[PDB]
Design a protein around this motif. Structure first.
Motif, PDB file in Angstrom:
ATOM      1  N   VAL A 270       0.845  -1.193   0.000  1.00 54.27           N
ATOM      2  CA  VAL A 270       0.000   0.000   0.000  1.00 54.27           C
ATOM      3  C   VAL A 270       0.883   1.248   0.000  1.00 54.27           C
ATOM      4  CG1 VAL A 270      -1.934   1.160   1.121  1.00 54.27           C
ATOM      5  CG2 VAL A 270      -1.658  -1.320   1.351  1.00 54.27           C
ATOM      6  N   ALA A 271       0.592   2.177  -0.905  1.00 56.51           N
ATOM      7  CA  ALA A 271       1.337   3.426  -0.913  1.00 56.51           C
ATOM      8  C   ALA A 271       1.039   4.236   0.344  1.00 56.51           C
ATOM      9  CB  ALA A 271       1.000   4.243  -2.159  1.00 56.51           C
ATOM     10  N   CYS A 272       2.036   5.004   0.788  1.00 56.78           N
ATOM     11  CA  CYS A 272       1.875   5.853   1.963  1.00 56.78           C
ATOM     12  C   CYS A 272       2.206   7.301   1.620  1.00 56.78           C
ATOM     13  CB  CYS A 272       2.757   5.366   3.110  1.00 56.78           C
ATOM     14  SG  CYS A 272       2.270   3.831   3.810  1.00 56.78           S
ATOM     15  N   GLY A 273       2.315   8.165   2.640  1.00 57.84           N
ATOM     16  CA  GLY A 273       2.773   9.526   2.397  1.00 57.84           C
ATOM     17  C   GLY A 273       4.218   9.565   1.947  1.00 57.84           C
ATOM     18  N   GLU A 274       5.039   8.683   2.510  1.00 56.09           N
ATOM     19  CA  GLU A 274       6.391   8.403   2.056  1.00 56.09           C
ATOM     20  C   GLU A 274       6.550   6.886   2.001  1.00 56.09           C
ATOM     21  OE1 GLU A 274       8.280  10.737   0.994  1.00 56.09           O
ATOM     22  OE2 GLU A 274       7.097  12.436   1.777  1.00 56.09           O
ATOM     23  N   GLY A 275       7.096   6.375   0.903  1.00 52.82           N
ATOM     24  CA  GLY A 275       7.302   4.939   0.852  1.00 52.82           C
ATOM     25  C   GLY A 275       6.008   4.125   0.767  1.00 52.82           C
ATOM     26  N   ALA A 276       6.146   2.824   1.044  1.00 56.66           N
ATOM     27  CA  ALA A 276       5.029   1.889   0.986  1.00 56.66           C
ATOM     28  C   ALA A 276       5.104   0.918   2.157  1.00 56.66           C
ATOM     29  CB  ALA A 276       5.008   1.099  -0.333  1.00 56.66           C
ATOM     30  N   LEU A 277       3.963   0.309   2.460  1.00 59.99           N
ATOM     31  CA  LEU A 277       3.830  -0.627   3.561  1.00 59.99           C
ATOM     32  C   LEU A 277       3.215  -1.915   3.043  1.00 59.99           C
ATOM     33  CD1 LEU A 277       4.285  -0.939   6.647  1.00 59.99           C
ATOM     34  CD2 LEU A 277       1.845  -0.312   6.871  1.00 59.99           C
ATOM     35  N   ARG A 278       3.880  -3.040   3.301  1.00 61.49           N
ATOM     36  CA  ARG A 278       3.417  -4.356   2.877  1.00 61.49           C
ATOM     37  C   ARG A 278       2.669  -4.951   4.062  1.00 61.49           C
ATOM     38  NH1 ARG A 278       4.763  -6.860  -2.019  1.00 61.49           N
ATOM     39  NH2 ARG A 278       6.736  -5.693  -1.754  1.00 61.49           N
ATOM     40  N   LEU A 279       1.366  -5.149   3.909  1.00 62.20           N
ATOM     41  CA  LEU A 279       0.564  -5.764   4.959  1.00 62.20           C
ATOM     42  C   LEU A 279       0.646  -7.279   4.828  1.00 62.20           C
ATOM     43  CD1 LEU A 279      -2.598  -3.545   4.936  1.00 62.20           C
ATOM     44  CD2 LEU A 279      -0.346  -2.938   5.747  1.00 62.20           C
ATOM     45  N   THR A 280       1.050  -7.956   5.902  1.00 62.26           N
ATOM     46  CA  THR A 280       1.243  -9.397   5.854  1.00 62.26           C
ATOM     47  C   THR A 280       0.266 -10.190   6.717  1.00 62.26           C
ATOM     48  OG1 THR A 280       2.960  -9.215   7.559  1.00 62.26           O
ATOM     49  CG2 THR A 280       3.717  -9.271   5.264  1.00 62.26           C
ATOM     50  N   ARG A 281      -0.451  -9.553   7.642  1.00 60.74           N
ATOM     51  CA  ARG A 281      -1.371 -10.270   8.520  1.00 60.74           C
ATOM     52  C   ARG A 281      -2.595  -9.402   8.775  1.00 60.74           C
ATOM     53  NH1 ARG A 281      -1.111 -14.929  11.232  1.00 60.74           N
ATOM     54  NH2 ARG A 281      -2.228 -15.180  13.224  1.00 60.74           N
ATOM     55  N   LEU A 282      -3.777  -9.930   8.450  1.00 66.89           N
ATOM     56  CA  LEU A 282      -5.026  -9.188   8.516  1.00 66.89           C
ATOM     57  C   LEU A 282      -6.112 -10.016   9.202  1.00 66.89           C
ATOM     58  CD1 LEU A 282      -4.974  -7.904   4.800  1.00 66.89           C
ATOM     59  CD2 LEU A 282      -4.250  -6.655   6.824  1.00 66.89           C
ATOM     60  N   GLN A 283      -7.200  -9.347   9.591  1.00 69.84           N
ATOM     61  CA  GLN A 283      -8.381 -10.017  10.148  1.00 69.84           C
ATOM     62  C   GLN A 283      -9.626  -9.257   9.716  1.00 69.84           C
ATOM     63  OE1 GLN A 283      -8.431 -10.539  14.479  1.00 69.84           O
ATOM     64  NE2 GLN A 283     -10.072 -12.078  14.395  1.00 69.84           N
ATOM     65  N   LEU A 284     -10.537  -9.938   9.009  1.00 70.66           N
ATOM     66  CA  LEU A 284     -11.807  -9.389   8.552  1.00 70.66           C
ATOM     67  C   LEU A 284     -12.868  -9.528   9.638  1.00 70.66           C
ATOM     68  CD1 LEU A 284     -10.658 -11.161   5.646  1.00 70.66           C
ATOM     69  CD2 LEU A 284     -12.111  -9.249   4.900  1.00 70.66           C
ATOM     70  N   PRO A 285     -13.970  -8.777   9.552  1.00 70.79           N
ATOM     71  CA  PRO A 285     -14.990  -8.840  10.615  1.00 70.79           C
ATOM     72  C   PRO A 285     -15.618 -10.228  10.727  1.00 70.79           C
ATOM     73  CG  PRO A 285     -15.794  -7.598   8.723  1.00 70.79           C
ATOM     74  CD  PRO A 285     -14.316  -7.773   8.528  1.00 70.79           C
ATOM     75  N   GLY A 286     -15.653 -10.744  11.952  1.00 71.81           N
ATOM     76  CA  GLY A 286     -16.150 -12.092  12.171  1.00 71.81           C
ATOM     77  C   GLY A 286     -15.304 -13.161  11.512  1.00 71.81           C
ATOM     78  N   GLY A 287     -13.983 -12.973  11.496  1.00 67.53           N
ATOM     79  CA  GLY A 287     -13.073 -13.942  10.923  1.00 67.53           C
ATOM     80  C   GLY A 287     -11.870 -14.147  11.826  1.00 67.53           C
ATOM     81  N   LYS A 288     -10.918 -15.062  11.347  1.00 64.77           N
ATOM     82  CA  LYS A 288      -9.698 -15.437  12.055  1.00 64.77           C
ATOM     83  C   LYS A 288      -8.505 -14.615  11.562  1.00 64.77           C
ATOM     84  N   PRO A 289      -7.480 -14.439  12.398  1.00 66.35           N
ATOM     85  CA  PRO A 289      -6.233 -13.835  11.915  1.00 66.35           C
ATOM     86  C   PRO A 289      -5.567 -14.722  10.873  1.00 66.35           C
ATOM     87  CG  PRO A 289      -6.361 -13.680  14.287  1.00 66.35           C
ATOM     88  CD  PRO A 289      -7.500 -14.560  13.863  1.00 66.35           C
ATOM     89  N   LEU A 290      -5.260 -14.129   9.724  1.00 71.58           N
ATOM     90  CA  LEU A 290      -4.759 -14.857   8.570  1.00 71.58           C
ATOM     91  C   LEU A 290      -3.552 -14.149   7.990  1.00 71.58           C
ATOM     92  CD1 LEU A 290      -8.116 -15.403   6.675  1.00 71.58           C
ATOM     93  CD2 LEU A 290      -6.910 -17.148   8.046  1.00 71.58           C
ATOM     94  N   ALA A 291      -2.578 -14.932   7.532  1.00 71.18           N
ATOM     95  CA  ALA A 291      -1.543 -14.377   6.671  1.00 71.18           C
ATOM     96  C   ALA A 291      -2.187 -13.904   5.375  1.00 71.18           C
ATOM     97  CB  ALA A 291      -0.454 -15.411   6.374  1.00 71.18           C
ATOM     98  N   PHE A 292      -1.649 -12.831   4.795  1.00 74.85           N
ATOM     99  CA  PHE A 292      -2.269 -12.348   3.570  1.00 74.85           C
ATOM    100  C   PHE A 292      -2.218 -13.414   2.479  1.00 74.85           C
ATOM    101  CE2 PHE A 292      -2.228 -10.222  -0.560  1.00 74.85           C
ATOM    102  CZ  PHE A 292      -3.441  -9.564  -0.498  1.00 74.85           C
ATOM    103  N   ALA A 293      -1.204 -14.284   2.515  1.00 71.25           N
ATOM    104  CA  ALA A 293      -1.104 -15.384   1.555  1.00 71.25           C
ATOM    105  C   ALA A 293      -2.351 -16.277   1.568  1.00 71.25           C
ATOM    106  CB  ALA A 293       0.153 -16.206   1.853  1.00 71.25           C
ATOM    107  N   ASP A 294      -2.877 -16.588   2.762  1.00 69.97           N
ATOM    108  CA  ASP A 294      -4.109 -17.372   2.875  1.00 69.97           C
ATOM    109  C   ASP A 294      -5.317 -16.578   2.377  1.00 69.97           C
ATOM    110  OD1 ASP A 294      -2.623 -19.556   4.050  1.00 69.97           O
ATOM    111  OD2 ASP A 294      -2.670 -18.490   5.978  1.00 69.97           O
ATOM    112  N   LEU A 295      -5.249 -15.252   2.457  1.00 73.80           N
ATOM    113  CA  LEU A 295      -6.272 -14.388   1.889  1.00 73.80           C
ATOM    114  C   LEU A 295      -6.084 -14.183   0.387  1.00 73.80           C
ATOM    115  CD1 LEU A 295      -6.743 -11.401   4.383  1.00 73.80           C
ATOM    116  CD2 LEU A 295      -8.375 -13.197   3.881  1.00 73.80           C
ATOM    117  N   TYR A 296      -4.837 -14.250  -0.106  1.00 74.24           N
ATOM    118  CA  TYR A 296      -4.564 -13.975  -1.518  1.00 74.24           C
ATOM    119  C   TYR A 296      -5.219 -14.993  -2.445  1.00 74.24           C
ATOM    120  CZ  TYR A 296      -2.345 -13.053  -5.922  1.00 74.24           C
ATOM    121  OH  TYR A 296      -2.121 -12.728  -7.238  1.00 74.24           O
ATOM    122  N   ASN A 297      -5.183 -16.283  -2.088  1.00 76.03           N
ATOM    123  CA  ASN A 297      -5.791 -17.286  -2.957  1.00 76.03           C
ATOM    124  C   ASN A 297      -7.313 -17.319  -2.852  1.00 76.03           C
TER     125      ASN A 297
END
Length: 310
Positions: A270-297
């Motif tokens: 994700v682009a930022c004000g300076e540089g970029a940030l790679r998000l690697t671990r997320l959680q959607l509402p009513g879901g489990k913590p997942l690596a983005f790889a498990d979300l990517y497929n």
């Protein structure tokens, strides 16, 4: 050996009381916060310090304020040599500092005079400090202004979160307090005066603060994600849908803040004000913590490049 009153509420505080129990001092009373109401129903939840005190047969004091004469009288009758205060929710007025023979000492989770106040663990990580620690301080009337009796430090790595630093300070603090008490009883330990010019304040976390501001420099957001792990956890939105951000690392890119530059097995850039940030671990509402790889497929098209978060 001394007659000690211990005052504290959370798990960080209980680790200090747990360590005093394996010392020759007499814990004559344990002060803690009144049991808080749960989110539903009528149950009242006992604090970490309260639970440990009960399990060890210690007397428990749960006054709502120390600024009335009844509670001050009850404390004075304990004939204490010293008060050990660790993450106690209540304000100790001057009259209470005056009650025990040696006053009141606090185990503060920072290298004072840095990060006086409410949230020293999160802010120290957030600010990019290279080290933090615990300060045993002699409590004064001001907010975390009192003289410094003993300090112990630990570095902050690029991988440290608020929780990893909490677990380390919860190990150092208890040992640090026992040592300061020994010097205090032997009369050989004296406090170092704080330099007010170097003091910083670690203000409590507010309502909107954990929501990600993508116009900030990526370095800052990367620290914020870590500092708020495991609480309160950073979040942002995508298509007006909430999204908690649980893991991030610095990436390379430029673009309008919040733009998805790339979506890959390795993460969401994700682009930022300076540089970029790679998000690697997320959680959607009513879901489990997942690596983005498990979300990517499984969420491939939902995080298509060019969308903007927020």
């Amino acid at each position: 050996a001394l007659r000690i009153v211990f005052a504290g509420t959370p798990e960080f505080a209980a680790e200090h009381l747990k360590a005093l129990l394996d010392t020759p001092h007499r814990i004559v009373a344990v002060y803690t916060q009144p049991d808080r109401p749960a989110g539903r129903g009528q149950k009242l939840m006992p604090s970490a310090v309260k639970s440990l005190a009960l399990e060890h047969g210690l007397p428990v004091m749960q006054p709502q304020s120390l600024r009335n004469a009844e509670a001050q009288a009850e404390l004075a009758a304990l004939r204490a040599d010293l008060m050990v205060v660790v993450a106690y929710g209540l304000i100790l007025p001057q009259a209470v500092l005056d009650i025990p023979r040696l006053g009141c000492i606090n185990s503060h989770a920072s290298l004072l005079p840095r990060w006086r106040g409410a949230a020293p663990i999160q802010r120290a990580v957030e600010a990019g400090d290279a080290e933090s620690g615990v300060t045993v301080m002699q409590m004064e009337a001001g907010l975390d202004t009192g003289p410094m009796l003993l300090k112990v430090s630990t570095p902050i790595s690029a991988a440290d979160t608020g929780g990893s630093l909490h677990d380390r300070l919860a190990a150092l603090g208890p040992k640090a307090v026992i040592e300061a008490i020994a010097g205090l009883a032997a009369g050989t330990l004296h406090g170092e005066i704080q330099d007010d010019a170097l003091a910083t304040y670690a203000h409590k976390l507010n309502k909107d603060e954990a929501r990600l501001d993508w116009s900030r420099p990526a370095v800052e957001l990367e620290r914020q994600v870590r500092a708020f792990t495991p609480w309160p956890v950073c979040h942002t939105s995508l298509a007006d849908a909430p999204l908690k951000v649980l893991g991030a690392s610095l990436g390379q890119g430029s673009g309008a803040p919040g733009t998805i530059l790339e979506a890959s097995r390795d993460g969401l850039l994700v682009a930022c004000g300076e540089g970029a940030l790679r998000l690697t671990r997320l959680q959607l509402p009513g879901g489990k913590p997942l690596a983005f790889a498990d979300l990517y497929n499984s969420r491939r098209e939902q995080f298509a490049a060019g969308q903007v978060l927020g």
